[PDB]
């Protein structure tokens, strides 16, 4: 019976977080859980999917992302933890995927999660130099309108959310560009505002 | 039910203030306050919105920029203030745009936001020296037309607001020019007038 | 024919002023009417070139150059609105270059735009400190340069005009240097008027 | 019967570019692209060539590289793409040497096609260092060479076409160089002017 097994994946998802949790070592824990999260996507897709799994299997994912945010926020170097938050969003965006949503509270929980992620991948990117900067916002960009074309649900509050993120992306930009000479204000400023026109358009295209 | 989660976040946000209020750094209680107002931003936007909850939405972005107006008049560099200052008040123009207004009451209030802003912002703006007062007026001045185009209403008392806004704001730089040599009274006057003439043609162009 | 493609070559460009005043981002605009610029320049050159095919490309590029004039006034740091300014004078100068100069209303017009230029480079220019105001005025007075050396006509008006500009140029200059103590003075008022003095001369060799 | 023969070629075409586009991984949208340009190539090396089929050639040969630039402009490592660009680039020099160009709207479409690549190619190569930049935009420069000597015909728009693409070379490389101090400014901008003088004395020696 597919409920028994949905229990019995997230007992074993809590124990396997307790135990990774209760590690000293910072990059052990964000390696540790980057490798449930995997294992984690492995699982559901063996266990067979209906409507009552659905939501279990929603809210362990959610609880093992924001356990791996929690522990990449607190150490190590802000390049190896982008990284690994770029991978496992990937991985988050493909359990989404394949679990499939139907409820809307599983639809409100992703959102908040994608935030969530959005505004850690800012805070901790925030601290690199120019090129690593645009090379990682070009990412989140890219992932954005990926995970925005993974979950489905209304336009409008699909709309509103990617403005909104866009225009926290956009901002950081600027607050770390105002800290550089007036030349490289022009190149990276043409370059974040064409990305960011063009996947707008790519979503706005996609939509209608 | 629209209706519960917006009591809800009513509520989170009323704790969230008061916990920050009784932190003893000013610094950091302006920081929070403006991470508080994105994330009540971020929360709109996924709130069901209808009518009963919009009065709701504005009263408590209401109370958070209330708050965040009056510690920011406590203490903390001038300039630091003013930027932060800024940059919650185009949350706020964001915020406004995304609940929509309908009722005369909302509209009355965030135009008594809008007075409060302009009176703190000039008032902390006047320690300042010429150039970073000539550009945190301008960028003041712009931000005004924006957030007048953003509330929809009655066109006599946007008309009305905006020349006594623009007339305090020049009657702020007069008084603080009458300081300096007769040379730069020609130069920033000159400069101030032509923006806030531009600035009024625009909007007088638009009502029509 | 050329006179069907200069006009859907006005109609493009017609609607993409519209569409790129309509966003609301000020520095986007910048930017994609430098682009506008650009992309007429590329196409006026493969457009075949006659005679009634001459005004019209005349006018679209004057009203895309008004058009930015017109918008980099409205907001934006002065020294990115200066350098862009100068790349767009730079790109209108060929552009009016490889349309080549028949009619008199074309060169009234040029004229015009180029007086408006200048106004609105010096109104702009007066808020920087002494080093950006000297450079941003050499470079103006060296493109000036290159303009009246572009356009041909009658002599008498390129005289009239140049010294007219040159006299604008020198009465900021005091204007501004009369804020600061006498020993700058000496110094910048003897760097202008030998770089005054030289493009003058340069002139005055040239259209003899 | 050659004419057929295009139209099935062609409807193959488009039925590879809308399978290829349908991919989610960029990487292989760009390698898919570039294969499919190269059998395109080696299509119509069999196609019989005349009159009729010749447009159709150069069409079907202008969707293949503007969809390829297109992707390429939406996601990837900038050098990958850069690379990718300048052999897809020799490929649609040599696909255009082999049709053969006769009417002048096929050339207006081959000049657009070459202006919209050389766009790109700048806007992604703005991001590299400086040893990699200097040297795509040497690659860049010769592929410009022989493109220009590529496609007959009237040799003025051959000039102004050519003059225009060396400036805004030139200018990206300035507005590159002024990141970075004093020194690197002889070396790098004496090996660029040498460059672009060498292929403007060559191709003005050639139209001779
Ligand atoms: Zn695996
Ligand atoms: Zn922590
Ligand atoms: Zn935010
Ligand atoms: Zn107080
Ligand atoms: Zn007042
Ligand atoms: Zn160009
Ligand atoms: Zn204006
Ligand atoms: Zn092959
Ligand atoms: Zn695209």
Redesign the interface.
């Given at each position: 019976n597919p409920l028994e097994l949905a229990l019995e994946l997230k007992e074993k998802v809590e124990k396997a977080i307790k135990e990774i949790l209760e590690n000293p070592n910072i990059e052990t824990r964000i390696l540790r859980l980057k490798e449930l999260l995997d294992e984690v996507l492995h699982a559901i897709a063996l266990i067979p999917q209906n409507e009552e799994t659905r939501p279990i299997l929603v809210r362990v994912v959610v609880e093992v992302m924001e356990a791996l945010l929690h522990a990449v926020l607190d150490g190590g170097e802000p390049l190896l933890n982008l990284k690994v938050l770029l991978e496992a969003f990937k991985t988050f965006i493909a359990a989404l995927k394949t679990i499939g949503f139907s409820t809307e509270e599983e639809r409100?929980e992703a959102?908040?999660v994608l935030?969530l992620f959005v505004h850690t991948f800012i805070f901790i990117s925030r601290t690199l130099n120019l090129?690593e900067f645009?090379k990682v916002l070009?990412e989140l960009i890219?992932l954005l309108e990926?995970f925005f074309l993974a979950v489905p649900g209304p336009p409008e509050?699909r709309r509103?959310?990617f403005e909104?993120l866009l225009?926290?992306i956009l901002?950081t930009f600027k607050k770390k560009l105002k800290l550089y000479?007036?030349?490289?204000?022009?190149?990276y400023?043409?370059?974040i505002?064409?990305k960011v026109?063009?996947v707008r358009k790519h979503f706005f295209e996609k939509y209608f």
């Open positions: 409100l959102y908040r935030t090129e645009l070009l890219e990926e509050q509103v959310l909104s225009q926290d901002n000479p007036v030349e490289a204000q022009i190149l400023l043409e370059i505002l064409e026109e063009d």
